[PDB]
Design a protein around this ligand. Sequence first.
Ligand code: XBF
Lengths: 231, 226
Amino acid sequence: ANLLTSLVRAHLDSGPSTAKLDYSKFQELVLPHFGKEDAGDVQQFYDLLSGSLEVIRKWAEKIPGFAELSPADQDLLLESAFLELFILRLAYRSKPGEGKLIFCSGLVLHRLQCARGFGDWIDSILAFSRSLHSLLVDVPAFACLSALVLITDRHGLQEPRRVEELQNRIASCLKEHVAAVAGCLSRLLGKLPELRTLCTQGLQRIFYLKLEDLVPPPPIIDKIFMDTLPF
Amino acid sequence: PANLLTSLVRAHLDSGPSTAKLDYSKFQELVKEDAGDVQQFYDLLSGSLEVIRKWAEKIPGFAELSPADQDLLLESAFLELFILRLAYRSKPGEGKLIFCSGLVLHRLQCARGFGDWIDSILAFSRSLHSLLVDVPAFACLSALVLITDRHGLQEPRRVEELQNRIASCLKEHVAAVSCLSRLLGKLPELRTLCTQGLQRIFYLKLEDLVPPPPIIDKIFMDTLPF
Ligand SMILES: CCCCCCCCN(C)C(=O)c1cc(O)c(O)c(O)c1
């Protein structure tokens, strides 16, 4: 289909091919002091977050109908879904059988290289990679599901009906694609609790790093952090 | 001063339960969080609020500080005062937590409310116990946690003068009986444990099964350096 083709184009252009996988910082072993971190670790944590948000903004821009939402509805959807999309995309593209995290830049980093910046959270994101990989979700389904994570009801949308209409079109597009392959949706929804838990772990880690204030969080991440806290 | 050590010991012993008023009625020797675990966590924290205030006012010098500095020192030090008094009063050997009301509980009857933090608190307690810290040494230690430099003090010189009097009183007692610096060594380990408390309240405010009571919330909000 034309919506599916567009969703798949956007997904594939928002990450790296096997070709431009960047091993310039990958180390199979490092010997970290666990349960602590330095300014360098925290800056990279924040840079990987910033890089993913930049890339998720350009992917959302290429979903048909999204660019025509009000600027504020675009922002609200992007902030509300950022953390959930960062985890879901990082989980889908990573190699947990080799302890490999693959960020959207093409940067590859060992579990142990992420431990200082991310803490426990990255162990859990790798656990979810295995969980996700076991469901054998093809690229076109994932391309739809990531968009359904973004284009969803949120408190404070100016045009909630336009967002629901676009939700309808994308849900319909996915149904068509699982019909075309049939000639797993109950099971996928089974994972939504681990994923909500991983979003909470993310907020826990930003809170901790803000408490420690080795380096301040980037303005745009700090706003997502603050705007997400129901209090 | 002299009579200062004695004043500090009297404050400490009057702030805690007489070995008589110890209450085992709710103690279970064999046993995520729901609302009752969160309510209990907030109740256990809240029970120390008035007791730590009454203790502070009985520290010679403390009522001589500006009212704003008093409130600031109390608020800044609450979590650490809670952890250290609990650590000292509790029997980690047996996983027995003893609250300043006399309530006695096993770690597994609080673990769901406190999370991981209770194991850290109990780890700290075993370590505190190892030093065999005598009541007078502890009477000054706890005061040193309260009477310490904080951001936003009106009279930081005066707060620092009071601290030095209390450290002098401690050093003298500890000499009159590397030990000193292993007592003082517990103050910064207490700050690291403070942080886990803030992490736990942050998490509970996110989950929001029950809201923190306003005085805890205020202490939470006022102790975030951002
Ligand atoms: C691996 C499982 C993820 C697949 C996406 C399924 C939910 C998408 N839909 C339809 C939503 O309305 C939605 C629901 C949410 O709980 C949510 O946080 C959100 O951002 C959007």
